[PDB]
Amino acid sequence: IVPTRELENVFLGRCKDYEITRYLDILPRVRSDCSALWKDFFKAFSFKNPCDLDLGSYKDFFTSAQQQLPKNKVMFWSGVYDEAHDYANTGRKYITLEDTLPGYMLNSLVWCGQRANPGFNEKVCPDFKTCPVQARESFWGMASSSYAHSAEGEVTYMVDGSNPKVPAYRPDSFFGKYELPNLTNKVTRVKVIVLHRLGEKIIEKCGAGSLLDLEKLVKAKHFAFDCVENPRAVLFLLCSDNPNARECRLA
Amino acid sequence: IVPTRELENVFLGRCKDYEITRYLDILPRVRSDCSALWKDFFKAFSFKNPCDLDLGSYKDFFTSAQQQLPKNKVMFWSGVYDEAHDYANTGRKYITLEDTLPGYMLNSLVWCGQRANPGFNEKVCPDFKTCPVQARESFWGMASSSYAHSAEGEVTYMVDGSNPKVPAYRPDSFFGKYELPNLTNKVTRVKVIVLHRLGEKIIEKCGAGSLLDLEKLVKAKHFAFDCVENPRAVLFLLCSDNPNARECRLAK
Numbered sequence: 451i452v453p454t455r456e457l458e459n460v461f462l463g464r465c466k467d468y469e470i471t472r473y474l475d476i477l478p479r480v481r482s483d484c485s486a487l488w489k490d491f492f493k494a495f496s497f498k499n500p501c502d503l504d505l506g507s508y509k510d511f512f513t514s515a516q517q518q519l520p521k522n523k524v525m526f527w528s529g530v531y532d533e534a535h536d537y538a539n540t541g542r543k544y545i546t547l548e549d550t551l552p553g554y555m556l557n558s559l560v561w562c563g564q565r566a567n568p569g570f571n572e573k574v575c576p577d578f579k580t581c582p583v584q585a586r587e588s589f590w591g592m593a594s595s596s597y598a599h600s601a602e603g604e605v606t607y608m609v610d611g612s613n614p615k616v617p618a619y620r621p622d623s624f625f626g627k628y629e630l631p632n633l634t635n636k637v638t639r640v641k642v643i644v645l646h647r648l649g650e651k652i653i654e655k656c657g658a659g660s661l662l663d664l665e666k667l668v669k670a671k672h673f674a675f676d677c678v679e680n681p682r683a684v685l686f687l688l689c690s691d692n693p694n695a696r697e698c699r700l701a
Numbered sequence: 702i703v704p705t706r707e708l709e710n711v712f713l714g715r716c717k718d719y720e721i722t723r724y725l726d727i728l729p730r731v732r733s734d735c736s737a738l739w740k741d742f743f744k745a746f747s748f749k750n751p752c753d754l755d756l757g758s759y760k761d762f763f764t765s766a767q768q769q770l771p772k773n774k775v776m777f778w779s780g781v782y783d784e785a786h787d788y789a790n791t792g793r794k795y796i797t798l799e800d801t802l803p804g805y806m807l808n809s810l811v812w813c814g815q816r817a818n819p820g821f822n823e824k825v826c827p828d829f830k831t832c833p834v835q836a837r838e839s840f841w842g843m844a845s846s847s848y849a850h851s852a853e854g855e856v857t858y859m860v861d862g863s864n865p866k867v868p869a870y871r872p873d874s875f876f877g878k879y880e881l882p883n884l885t886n887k888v889t890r891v892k893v894i895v896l897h898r899l900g901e902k903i904i905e906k907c908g909a910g911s912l913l914d915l916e917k918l919v920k921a922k923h924f925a926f927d928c929v930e931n932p933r934a935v936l937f938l939l940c941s942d943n944p945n946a947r948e949c950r951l952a953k
């Protein structure tokens with residue numbers, strides 16, 4: 451595992467690119483400049499062993515970088531990365547973490563502390579499995595919480611309903627750990643979209659199994675709940691990438 | 702018209718992010734560093750009246766910034782930007798100009814030279830619909846030529862087939878003026894995709910009108926040629942935006 455080259459430059463360029471040209475009509479600018487954001491980011495991990503972090507490490511970075519989020523537009527997802535992002539459509543239909551400023555700046559990047567100068571490793575980072583969970587999950591854990599905590603109105607949640615190993619919904623997922631429990635009374639409704647991958651056994655449905663657990667979880671938060679399996683707009687995206695599938699048949 | 706603010710820092714930040722993180726398994730890095738590429742880009746329009754630009758103003762920029770392009774992967778489009786970009790899918794199915802370094806760096810950006818210091822106008826840029834052709838198309842003109850010149854194998858051309866005012870193929874489109882003519886014998890085939898927008902009149906069709914005109918040109922340059930209208934993978938894409946259109950009806 452090799453850390454990203456020139457982390458600062460990459461960070462600052464993405465930041466600046468975003469500030470000036472990305473999501474102008476879709477998401478707000480943040481107060482802080484890019485240097486202030488770098489400093490809040492860099493201090494969370496710098497000059498410490500790579501496993502020396504906890505859930506508060508990136509807090510200041512997150513307070514600074516957190517945008518207000520448009521009401522009704524926030525998408526969550528589990529095990530269906532590509533499909534959620536394709537349906538969300540780079541912010542035209544839904545917002546994901548990746549469209550926000552910090553998710554955008556840190557997407558796919560690899561970084562870690564070391565004690566010795568220059569304060570970070572330029573060679574190798576530990577496998578995440580070696581660090582305690584609080585350190586391992588310090589960045590995306592906090593990013594997940596911050597993003598969820600900012601959601602207003604309706605929220606959408608896309609899941610895999612054809613994984614035989616992994617339930618559609620799980621408390622131990624990032625959604626289960628950081629997102630759902632952090633949704634505030636500004637949220638009105640959790641709309642689930644269940645993906646049944648084309649040509650695969652259907653494993654989970656609305657009203658059954660882990661989806662029934664979710665339903666209950668949600669009502670107890672006092673939100674409203676709906677659930678739908680392969681709605682047509684999602685179905686159609688699945689079918690462009692597999693047009694010969696039985697599910698994508700005309701006439 | 703309003704120029705992009707902090708043009709240099711946008712260019713530079715864009716170029717470094719692309720360099721270290723973008724399209725890594727899809728598109729080659731260029732030899733030249735970001736700093737150098739700013740220079741070639743700046744010198745091209747800097748310290749000249751805006752309309753004082755020609756086909757060759759950005760030739761040095763493009764030499765430095767041109768990447769080789771994966772065979773069978775390049776896509777050109779005319780009149781159907783969003784669909785073509787959606788269908789190409791950020792370089793996974795096809796590559797577009799805006800997936801390339803120069804395309805990625807300058808996409809959306811707005812800029813212009815002035816005679817006086819600092820040589821560019823951070824405050825205003827003329828209605829470029831008022832500059833001479835060669836000067837208004839000086840930048841994307843060169844980009845398109847260079848892109849086309851770098852294309853290898855089969856190329857795809859997606860076109861609007863439901864436009865009564867604008868032929869699917871014209872010799873004065875960016876395609877007709879700068880791409881088609883710059884297709885080298887590295888190219889073997891032009892595969893035309895015709896977009897019949899959902900619930901509009903079909904205007905053009907494979908083998909008639911401008912398309913037959915296109916087909917004749919392509920074969921003259923000794924490439925192979927084919928053409929389809931709304932292939933299913935494209936249809937399905939359009940239907941996601943308009944699920945209740947007549948032409949997206951599905952089986953019982």
Ligand SMILES: *[C@H]1O[C@H](COP(=O)(O)OP(=O)(O)OC[C@H]2O[C@@H](n3cnc4c(N)ncnc43)[C@H](O)[C@@H]2O)[C@@H](O)[C@@H]1F
Binds near residue numbers: 527528558624
């Ligand atoms: C916040 O959380 C969920 C996504 O995580 P889940 O565990 O619910 O879903 P899953 O597919 O099982 O996890 C995939 C892993 O990828 C990581 N991840 C999330 N976001 C990013 C970005 N931008 N870059 C790289 N990795 C990312 C997670 O940490 C998971 O471990 C979403 O609804 C919200 F994003």
Ligand SMILES: *[C@H]1O[C@H](COP(=O)(O)OP(=O)(O)OC[C@H]2O[C@@H](n3cnc4c(N)ncnc43)[C@H](O)[C@@H]2O)[C@@H](O)[C@@H]1F
Binds near residue numbers: 809845
């Ligand atoms: C090279 O060009 C074509 C796209 O241009 P066409 O003129 O063939 O198609 P149309 O949709 O009618 O016109 C696009 C016009 O916009 C300019 N342009 C092309 N690409 C850009 C970018 N990235 N930013 C701003 N303007 C752009 C052209 O000047 C056209 O006049 C594609 O096949 C190739 F990319």
